[PDB]
Amino acid sequence: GANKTVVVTTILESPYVMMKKNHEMLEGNERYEGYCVDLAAEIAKHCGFKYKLTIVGDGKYGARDADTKIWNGMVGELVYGKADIAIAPLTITLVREEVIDFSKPFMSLGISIMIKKGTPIESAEDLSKQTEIAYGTLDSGSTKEFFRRSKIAVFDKMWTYMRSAEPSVFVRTTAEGVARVRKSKGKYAYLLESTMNEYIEQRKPCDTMKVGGNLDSKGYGIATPKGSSLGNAVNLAVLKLSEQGLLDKLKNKWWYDKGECG
Amino acid sequence: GANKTVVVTTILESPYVMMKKNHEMLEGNERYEGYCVDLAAEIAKHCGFKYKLTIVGDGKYGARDADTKIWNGMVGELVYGKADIAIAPLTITLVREEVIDFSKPFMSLGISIMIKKGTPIESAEDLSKQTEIAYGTLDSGSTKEFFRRSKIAVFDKMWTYMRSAEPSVFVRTTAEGVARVRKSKGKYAYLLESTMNEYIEQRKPCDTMKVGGNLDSKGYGIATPKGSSLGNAVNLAVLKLSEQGLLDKLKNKWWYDKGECG
Ligand SMILES: O=C1CCCN1Cc1ccc(-n2nc(C(F)(F)F)c3c2CCCC3)cc1F
Ligand SMILES: N[C@@H](CCC(=O)O)C(=O)O
Ligand SMILES: N[C@@H](CCC(=O)O)C(=O)O
Ligand SMILES: [Zn+2]
Ligand SMILES: [Zn+2]
Ligand SMILES: [Zn+2]
Numbered sequence: 001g002a003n004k005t006v007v008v009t010t011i012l013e014s015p016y017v018m019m020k021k022n023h024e025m026l027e028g029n030e031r032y033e034g035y036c037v038d039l040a041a042e043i044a045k046h047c048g049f050k051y052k053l054t055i056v057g058d059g060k061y062g063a064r065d066a067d068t069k070i071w072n073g074m075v076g077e078l079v080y081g082k083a084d085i086a087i088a089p090l091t092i093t094l095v096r097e098e099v100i101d102f103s104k105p106f107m108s109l110g111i112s113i114m115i116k117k118g119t120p121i122e123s124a125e126d127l128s129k130q131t132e133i134a135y136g137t138l139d140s141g142s143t144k145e146f147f148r149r150s151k152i153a154v155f156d157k158m159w160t161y162m163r164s165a166e167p168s169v170f171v172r173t174t175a176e177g178v179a180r181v182r183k184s185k186g187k188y189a190y191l192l193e194s195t196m197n198e199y200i201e202q203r204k205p206c207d208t209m210k211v212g213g214n215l216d217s218k219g220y221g222i223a224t225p226k227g228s229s230l231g232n233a234v235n236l237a238v239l240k241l242s243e244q245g246l247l248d249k250l251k252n253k254w255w256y257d258k259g260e261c262g
Numbered sequence: 263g264a265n266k267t268v269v270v271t272t273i274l275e276s277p278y279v280m281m282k283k284n285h286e287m288l289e290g291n292e293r294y295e296g297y298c299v300d301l302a303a304e305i306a307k308h309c310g311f312k313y314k315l316t317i318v319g320d321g322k323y324g325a326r327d328a329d330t331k332i333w334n335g336m337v338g339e340l341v342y343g344k345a346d347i348a349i350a351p352l353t354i355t356l357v358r359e360e361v362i363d364f365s366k367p368f369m370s371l372g373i374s375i376m377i378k379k380g381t382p383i384e385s386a387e388d389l390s391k392q393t394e395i396a397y398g399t400l401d402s403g404s405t406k407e408f409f410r411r412s413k414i415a416v417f418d419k420m421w422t423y424m425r426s427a428e429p430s431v432f433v434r435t436t437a438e439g440v441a442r443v444r445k446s447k448g449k450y451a452y453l454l455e456s457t458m459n460e461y462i463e464q465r466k467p468c469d470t471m472k473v474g475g476n477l478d479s480k481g482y483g484i485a486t487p488k489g490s491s492l493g494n495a496v497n498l499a500v501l502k503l504s505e506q507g508l509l510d511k512l513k514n515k516w517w518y519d520k521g522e523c524g
């Protein structure tokens with residue numbers, strides 16, 4: 001039947017989506033800016049739909065509760081029919097691919113280490129071989145599941161530590177992890193995606209840094225509910241944006257053009 | 263009905279598929295080795311099929327003739343029903359995605375520059391601003407189409423040069439491009455995928471090198487004909503291999519463990 005306004009689920013995560021200063025009482029999509037705001041506009045333009053940006057209600061990426069089996073976060077909003085599409089730094093994973101559809105990736109990333117400058121840590125192996133410096137991840141996302149599932153000896157040992165460390169090494173939001181690194185005088189390191197890490201490293205007060213290689217190699221994808229009418233066209237649009245150089249332009253706009261650290 | 267042996271199309275391209283020394287008169291899959299031989303074995307194991315490796319008849323990746331509209335290469339073998347699956351360093355592109363299905367990527371890569379050591383070239387911009395050093399690409403693949411289509415000013419200018427340069431700057435196989443770099447005393451540079459470039463840079467006689475950043479950012483995917491019964495299971499298998507660390511193991515086996523240049 002008639003076209004409907006597509007409900008887009010996304011998450012307040014710098015530099016992907018941020019509320020514009022003093023727009024708290026304005027209306028609609030114009031309230032937000034960032035990489036995924038720009039990406040949403042292009043994907044809608046190429047696919048021919050109108051859309052509304054909405055912030056995921058529970059502030060989470062998406063994980064399945066072990067007991068209840070209920071999906072939360074943006075994945076949940078797609079699975080239970082609360083949104084039509086997720087346009088966010090949402091990691092393509094097997095367990096998610098089983099319940100929702102992903103486009104081809106629009107970014108690359110890997111899990112990485114953030115330290116406060118001067119922290120004597122250069123690698124995951126370094127972190128795993130000491131106990132003075134605490135370390136954790138975001139509490140309900142793909143990074144935590146990576147450690148939970150890994151059979152690689154260094155990551156397995158890291159998980160054995162994190163899962164029972166006190167106080168909890170896990171955080172609710174990327175911002176909380178970053179703030180914890182910055183206030184802990186070097187006694188907390190944060191495990192997060194390289195994209196987020198590299199962004200923060202170029203933001204004032206310029207006191208964090210990415211160290212070592214990425215622990216893995218994966219992508220973000222645009223997600224739709226299984227059997228969505230949008231999935232095919234969205235996939236082709238991602239490839240077009242890739243080949244036209246648009247995804248590279250948006251990366252350079254929101255990371256490197258935004259740099260504050262010289 | 264009953265399961266059939268899956269016909270796999272692939273291409274002789276180091277280190278993805280190579281004929282084992284002195285096996286020219288042996289039979290079957292045991293004749294071949296390499297990254298994509300190992301990947302094929304895992305994808306078949308996870309998906310529960312038997313398979314035969316075959317080398318694409320025309321030795322090409324896959325492009326659509328502008329006049330006849332016929333697809334050649336591995337893409338053609340899928341489009342005309344000559345193979346069931348392509349497991350090769352086959353680039354995910356829009357024009358291909360329109361006629362065949364790709365899995366999520368199993369590698370990353372970008373177009374890159376190979377020079378003979380000592381060549382005074384550090385970038386695509388350098389190449390584009392001079393005429394003493396010739397440069398080209400593989401004649402029937404995604405790199406050539408990248409230059410043909412680009413509207414980025416440096417790449418557009420490079421394409422204007424390559425398309426009418428004499429003798430032809432284009433080559434039939436990656437090996438021919440590499441040999442041309444090595445014999446040209448620095449007067450030919452070769453535009454090829456970073457994966458291939460980085461492999462060759464660690465092989466004797468250790469006289470080539472990758473220079474500058476990648477020009478783009480994309481992936482290889484496993485390809486199946488549209489409506490194949492294999493596509494879904496193959497996609498999920500790629501994600502599993504990614505998350506289990508298997509794709510990283512295979513990369514380190516065929517690139518860095520294979521290094522000859524110290
Ligand atoms: O190592 C592995 C195996 C599992 C995934 N991954 C890393 C990885 C991440 C992203 C990309 N792609 N692919 C494409 C494309 F669809 F081809 F256009 C693009 C990207 C990066 C973003 C722009 C386009 C490719 C990758 F290989
Ligand atoms: N991108 C992650 C969230 C960030 C993280 O887990 O590090 C996800 O989709 O779950
Ligand atoms: N991977 C390329 C071939 C190599 C190249 O074009 O540089 C393709 O799929 O067409
Ligand atoms: Zn405004
Ligand atoms: Zn566009
Ligand atoms: Zn043998």
Ligand SMILES: [Zn+2]
Pocket residue numbers: 304307308508
């Ligand atoms: Zn396996």
